[model samples]
Target: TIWQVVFIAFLTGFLALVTIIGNILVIVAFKVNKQLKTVNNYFLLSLACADLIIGVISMNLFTTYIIMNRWALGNLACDLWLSIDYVASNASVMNLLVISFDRYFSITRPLTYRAKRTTKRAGVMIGLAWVISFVLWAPAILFWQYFVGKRTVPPGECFIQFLSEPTITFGTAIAAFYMPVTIMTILYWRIYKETEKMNIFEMLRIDEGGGSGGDEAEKLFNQDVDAAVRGILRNAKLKPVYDSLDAVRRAALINMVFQMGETGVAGFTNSLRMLQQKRWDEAAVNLAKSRWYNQTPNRAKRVITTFRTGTWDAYLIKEKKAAQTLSAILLAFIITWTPYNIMVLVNTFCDSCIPKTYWNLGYWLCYINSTVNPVCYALCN
Candidate 1:
């Protein structure tokens, strides 16, 4: 039991951490990421509402209970959990019901309801869900013990301390879980039915019979751009191929796509399948037969070779930008040694006058360059 307790607490602690991180990301995305500001975002905001509360506030206590198997936090925290926890959880269910309601309207009366929908309108419904949730649970939980004139759960035990009042018992739970789930299910089923019956085929061509569908060419620019960038790995099912390559080869493959558009690269489907499946030599052979190979032969050679070998060495010669002082040092070394090198050659072959003092200068210059080499390294080293 002790071992089980340790494992369970650790597991729940990580789960609560993940929940906190994931919901915070959704909250950040809706608030910060550049996207269409629409009713869709408001609904997302609503869904995130309960989750952020649950993850950050309540989940720690829950995980703590898994470790202690009893409430170690104070009496005040216990009451807060009894009341505040209900508000957060009930708000989640309430948000789902409201979401279905909005979506049902969205599909059934697109133009009409879309015009009627705005941020403020959506906010009203979101606020309504939260308000109803808190009223139903928070206030009732807060006042229940006071009105009944007793607390039922004692220390180290956290539970709702309500009397055996059957109406309060059955009605509270009924509205909280059972009722909302049933209504959301019915609303969603209606939404599905409405979607099936939509006469979109009759509507679109004739909406040119109206105002807004006229600028479809405008949306086409947006969508076509979305497709060219999005269509390949997403639409073309080539994500596996992209992901299989090392970083260098991955760059080479996308470079090829940028040249020919992703579909053309995607069209080499046989090769692409092999590219990811570790049959790389055959894929390289398949790549050789393409018009891409035929067009710019040397460039294709380098790209295809990189794809085959999965190395960047053939494609680039580079170091960190500041380190090219070695190039300058090369010039200095060559200049410094040239005189001594010539004097040595002449002393050996020419057998002519070695001016002994001139020979000393050449030898000294060679040694001086070696000393300066270390100083040059100090420029960066």
Candidate 2:
């Protein structure tokens, strides 16, 4: 019995630990990052918050009751515990039902769903989850009788009989679990059926070339190209008259080249200066020695040869500089964000073993990259 108690305690403690830390991280991650504040994520946030409370308080009480095999706390504590257990468990299932419904609509009617699923709608849905959960479990507050003199269960006996009232038991079970399960199952099946009809290729190929052929599609394509051209060059000068779509595409590509040239100018400035001074070997070494070379050795080697050949393609030079700029930006982001994420993961697995100071510093360091990024870009240029 002692061995059994120890084993049970260990299992309950582990589950509670994992549930607490995991859900807290989800909550904190969503709260800390504004970019993650989407309608779907709010649903997830509510679910995690409910689960976290269940893990930290409800489950802990249940585990202690299990280990002791009786109620040590007074009658009101017992009532409070049961009410919380019921509310949290029911809320989790309800939140999951909402999430599945959201998923179904988003998957089945993506455009209409995106238009309808706003922050206010998501908040209302989350609020309804809590309200419904409390209403469903409110009967327990009255039925359990938390008052000292009016307690139904004896001091030593905590495991109250739900089956004593078969109607309440069956009704609560159906409302809390069965109905939600059935609805979610149906929604998920329909979601699967709808998703299979989605053309992954069509989604990936998001340009006008990928869609069905028509005059409207042609007009959309030209509009998209014009938008892209404007984005690529803020003050893009276009010919008063274009010969064809081919001409527009050529113009877009030229604007892209100009943007690339601007990004590359500073990145390649030192290399170009060395080349101009006839320091071919130094310039070639500088151009070749980059993180990009590790990815595309052949291209890196070919670009390196251009410095020595004296016959250089402006496009190739621009490509090399763009690669360097991109590589630098990626490196900066990784260096800044990785430590915080790593420490959080470590704390998750190790039972919050990491010190608070270290955790705070890691989080601080992560945001420093964002703060310094604009300055880094300025320096790069």
Model 2 error, position 265 (Å): 33
- TM-score to true structure, per model: 0.52, 0.52
Tens digits of lDDT, candidate 1, 1-381: 698777767765665666666666666766786673556556656655566666666766655654665888887788787666677656665665665566667556554574566788778877887888777666566777788787777788676666234345545545554566457556556654543342222122222233233356547634654454455568445678877777666667665665677767778889888888889899889999989889867767867777787765343322221123333344454576568655554554444477855764564454334333333434532
Model 1 poorest 10 in a row by lDDT:
198-207
Q: Quote model 1's TM-score.
A: 0.52
Lowest lDDT block of 10, candidate 2: 236-245
Query: Per-residue error at 137 for model 1, in Å?
Result: 2.1
- Give candidate 1's whole-model lDDT: 0.60
lDDT of all predictions: 0.60, 0.55
Question: What lDDT does candidate 2 reach at residue 168?
Answer: 54
lDDT of 2 at 234: 53
